[PDB]
Curated annotation (Swiss-Prot), chain A:
This is Sordarin/hypoxysordarin biosynthesis cluster protein G. It comes from the Eukaryota. Keywords: Antibiotic biosynthesis. GO terms for biological process: antibiotic biosynthetic process. Pathway: Antibiotic biosynthesis. Part of the gene cluster that mediates the biosynthesis of sordarin and hypoxysordarin, glycoside antibiotics with a unique tetracyclic diterpene aglycone structure. First, the geranylgeranyl diphosphate synthase sdnC constructs GGDP from farnesyl diphosphate and isopentenyl diphosphate. The diterpene cyclase sdnA then catalyzes the cyclization of GGDP to afford cycloaraneosene. Cycloaraneosene is then hydroxylated four times by the putative cytochrome P450 monooxygenases sdnB, sdnE, sdnF and sdnH to give a hydroxylated cycloaraneosene derivative such as cycloaraneosene-8,9,13,19-tetraol. InterPro entries: NTF2-like_dom_sf, SnoaL-like.
Amino acid sequence: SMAGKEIQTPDQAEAFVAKVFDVLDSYDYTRFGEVLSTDLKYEGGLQKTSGLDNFINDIKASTQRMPGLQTSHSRYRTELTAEGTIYSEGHSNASLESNPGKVVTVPMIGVFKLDSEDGKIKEMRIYKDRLPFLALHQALPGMK
Amino acid sequence: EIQTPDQAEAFVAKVFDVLDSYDYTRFGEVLSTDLKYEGGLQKTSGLDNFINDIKASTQRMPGLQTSHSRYRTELTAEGTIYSEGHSNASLESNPGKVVTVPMIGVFKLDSEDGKIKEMRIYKDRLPFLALHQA
């Protein structure tokens, strides 16, 4: 449908990032292709995928690893550079349906590059400390 | 015991952990018996009135889950804590729907025991109208 081709200001850029995470954190895979390029290059720590199908499969597997996983993101400062890069700093939150009172929250930043043809995200690199999430139930069975 | 902004932010984090866990019998560990609270049009004097105000909100919206994050905190020469962050809410009955708004808290401490004697929380409640939406 629509992505980020009309982005020319950092306000428009943060609005797009929020739309993107709304899609991602809903796990509505049928909508991922509205905002993510078919050739998406994603990095999140040591985990790396090339192509939208491989990205979707990795996200689906993460919901198997952790039944009941719920995730959400907020942002407080975003810049759009003259190279077209979007940098967005915020927080990443996660909890499990089986224990909703325990929420792990860490700072995060997303780096995004858009396809010039259609404004979809062609490169997405998310940086955050994933170690605190081992506190979630059965993140690492047997301790960590 | 709070002399630095890092100590102030750690204390605010502890306070919101207690509040967002709805640990009412522990509120007095961090909140003065004479707490003056204001959150928009909600306003209470005294800890027991604060607890009852919060209980009323949870009973009215069953399954409410809340959490807070913060990105900057100041501790002033007068001893005031200002902490800017985000307030998140979701419903146990509506997994996947999270509403997040910017927020700021203003805190003044009792000089005798370090408990919060004034707490003023500012945020827009309008976006939370979307909490029950699929």
